[PDB]
Structure 1
Amino acid sequence: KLATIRTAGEITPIAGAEAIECCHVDGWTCVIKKGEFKQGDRGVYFEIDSFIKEDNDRYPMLSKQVIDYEGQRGTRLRTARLRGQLSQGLFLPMDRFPELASNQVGDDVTEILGITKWEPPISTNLSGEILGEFPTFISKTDQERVQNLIPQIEENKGQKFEVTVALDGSSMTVYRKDDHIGVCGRNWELRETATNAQWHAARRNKMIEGLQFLNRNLALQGEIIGESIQGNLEKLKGQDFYLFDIYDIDKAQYLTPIERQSLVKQLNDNGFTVKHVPILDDLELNHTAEQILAMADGPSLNKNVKREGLVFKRLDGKFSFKAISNAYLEKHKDR
């Protein structure tokens, strides 16, 4: 949903810079030309991580940021601090997009506009030998951003959420399906070799033994972090796995936070040393997205570094979201 038709929110002046103003778009704030929008106007909002192919007719404002990425010429949208105000994304009025004049507010126009997703590089240590596709019977490990969930955030006030720290590593899944035990990176199931980091991490914490012990069709999903993995924010020696989700393959749903905490308890009780991402205090929601983003800034697993953000999983287990820390995004231009 990289490029969607959205609505200009509150529009606040850039005290000092007359040619620009700051436009609220859902939970996002975005710098625009003065007068480009009034509140209530529609436009195409391109989220950060959008990759937009070179085009000086439609996107002259991105000309000086064109780069070479996976074979194409385009610009990557990322967090910036333009003239004292945080800016994320690009918001262009509907009249610049004549082929969308019959689309509706909220339409996903990513495919029609030719927008692709920028992603950081896969860590050199982690692209082992591919055995097969990521299993279609397991869900991948992504979360919608709080900035895109303004109505759902009001809906869910008072509801309680498990609050966990997001770690800056690489997604890893270790699963059992009947007589098969498998290890996956973010997009692929991997073959066990001596140098495969994900398999190594799964053997050392004995989580394959733990899945054989538990005797259920489960996928243990989490982050592998540490040296030579995405800059090693947390200052580990070596590498380790930190669980954040357990997916029930037979029922095709995630375990609730309490379900998942109990099982990790029992695994550790039996010698299966499976670590879990830092679990903060349960949060009773009654916050704006702005406030949740403010919570996101803080210490990580290593308490002397700025964490990537927070993940919020409602205690019944079927509503989750993430709040990435903007302090973190300002510090890490590769994020």
Structure 2
Amino acid sequence: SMGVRKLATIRTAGEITPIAGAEAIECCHVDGWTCVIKKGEFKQGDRGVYFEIDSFIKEDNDRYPMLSKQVIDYEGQRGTRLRTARLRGQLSQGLFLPMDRFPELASNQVGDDVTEILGITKWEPPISTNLSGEILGEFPTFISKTDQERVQNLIPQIEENKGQKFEVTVKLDGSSMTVYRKDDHIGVCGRNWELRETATNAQWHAARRNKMIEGLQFLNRNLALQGEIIGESIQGNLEKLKGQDFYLFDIYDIDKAQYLTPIERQSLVKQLNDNGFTVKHVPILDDLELNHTAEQILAMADGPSLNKNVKREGLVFKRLDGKFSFAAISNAYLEKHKDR
């Protein structure tokens, strides 16, 4: 499982509309996204390369001259983090570039993932030294990463899922953490690396605090507990917790290489807590029978977080059969918190 989003893909330009002023620019609809394009770059139906927000694009003035004055330093390389913006009142998300800048992609077709072919990587918010402390080894290849596809890329699948029921959960803005057991080994990982138990490491700290390692042996299955660590010194601690804590949002069955269903996951969470292992869960909302447009789902995303007077990052939707999940991120949140 490559639980990663497809950062750069070949897409088709949708409807194009103007924007007053020195309109060297216009509005381009790319499937569920709106992004601002330069005048005459595209006409509806043209193929282009769409880079999603959170893409990191390494500096290249021949390739991407339009990002040259947007660059920052990220993981030791000069490049541009694609971020939500508002351009003369027009919300703009992602970068859409015509095929003439990518002659090597000439044969590629709509839908193709060219993330790897173009050297694009995922920007992620900084973390302190307690959250990236002393990498032990690679992230286990037998465990899926935790990322969720965005609803803007799923408009056809949303309509095909009308009538299906989903677990709705609050998306917390922390650092993703995995605690797993595989047959005499129990490890703790950050986003992208397995971590070692430096008595200063925050992931290991949280795993020890809630006994979830002892919990994993009480379960005695090869499982990966995946969740968000939040609190002090993490994304400014807007939930206003004291200390740090782990909030579970998925359980991966390693031997079956699939996520447990919401009912199978809420099953184990009850058992863990019943036996002294106090594993918290991301807030769970009422189930939703899906009968909604993408715009309705995105309007649902804005709301209260773990702390009720803090605006949440968004919502995650998980079909009760476990084979379809997606995220709806609040655009108000993205506009406000553009450090993240």
TM-score normalised by L of structure 1: 0.94
Q: 1:285 to 1:208 in 2, by over 3 A?
A: same
State whether residues 80 and 86 of structure 1, in contact with CA within 8 Å, keep that contact through their aligned partners in structure 2. Answer: yes
CA distance in structure 2 between the aligned counterparts of 1:179 and 1:56, rounded to whole angstroms: 51
TM-fit CA distance, 1:152: 1.3
Q: Choose the corresponding residue for 1:210, options 207, 215, 220.
A: 215
Task: Report Cα offsets for 1:170-214 as digits up to 9, x if no partner.
Answer: 111112222222222222222223222222211221212222222
CA distance in structure 1 between the aligned counterparts of 2:85 and 2:128, rounded to whole angstroms: 25
TM-fit CA distance, 1:299: 0.9
Q: 1:322 to 1:196 in 2, by over 3 A?
A: same
TM-fit CA distance, 1:232: 1.4
In structure 2, the residue corresponding to 1:4 is in which secondary structure?
strand
Task: Report Cα offsets for 1:97-132 as digits up to 9, x if no partner.
Answer: 333332212222233333333222233221223332
Q: Which moved more, 1:30-39 or 1:83-92?
A: 30-39
Q: Which moved more, 1:252-261 or 1:172-181?
A: 172-181
Q: 1:58 to 1:195 in 2, by over 3 A?
A: closer
In structure 2, the residue corresponding to 1:209 is in which secondary structure?
helix
In structure 1, the residue corresponding to 2:251 is in which secondary structure?
strand
Q: 1:196 to 1:66 in 2, by over 3 A?
A: closer
In structure 2, the residue corresponding to 1:328 is in which secondary structure?
helix
TM-fit CA distance, 1:30: 0.3
In structure 2, the residue corresponding to 1:111 is in which secondary structure?
coil
Q: Which moved more, 1:315-324 or 1:102-111?
A: 102-111
Q: Show structure 1 runs of 5+ residues with no match.
A: none
TM-fit CA distance, 1:332: 1.3
TM-fit CA distance, 1:17: 5.8
Equivalent positions of 1:90-239 (< 5 A) are 90-239=95-244
CA distance in structure 1 between the aligned counterparts of 2:302 and 2:324, rounded to whole angstroms: 22
Runs of 4+ in 1 over 4 A off after TM superposition: none
Q: Which moved more, 1:170-179 or 1:317-326?
A: 170-179
Q: Which moved more, 1:160-169 or 1:48-57?
A: 48-57
Q: 1:112 to 1:208 in 2, by over 3 A?
A: closer
Task: Report Cα offsets for 1:223-273 as digits up to 9, x if no partner.
Answer: 111001222121111011100011112322211001111221122222221
State whether residues 206 and 272 of structure 1, in contact with CA within 8 Å, keep that contact through their aligned partners in structure 2. Answer: yes
In structure 1, the residue corresponding to 2:310 is in which secondary structure?
coil
Fraction of identical pairs, as percent: 99
**Alpha carbon RMSD of aligned pairs, Å?**
1.8
Q: 1:181 to 1:99 in 2, by over 3 A?
A: closer
Equivalent positions of 1:1-335 (< 5 A) are 1-15=6-20, 18-335=23-340
TM-fit CA distance, 1:67: 2.8
Q: 1:58 to 1:189 in 2, by over 3 A?
A: closer
Equivalences, count = 335
Q: 1:67 to 1:250 in 2, by over 3 A?
A: closer
In structure 2, the residue corresponding to 1:110 is in which secondary structure?
coil
TM-fit CA distance, 1:166: 0.9
CA distance in structure 2 between the aligned counterparts of 1:188 and 1:113, rounded to whole angstroms: 23
State whether residues 27 and 290 of structure 1, in contact with CA within 8 Å, keep that contact through their aligned partners in structure 2. Answer: no
Q: 1:215 to 1:294 in 2, by over 3 A?
A: same
Q: 1:322 to 1:90 in 2, by over 3 A?
A: same
TM-score normalised by L of structure 2: 0.92
Q: 1:108 to 1:175 in 2, by over 3 A?
A: closer
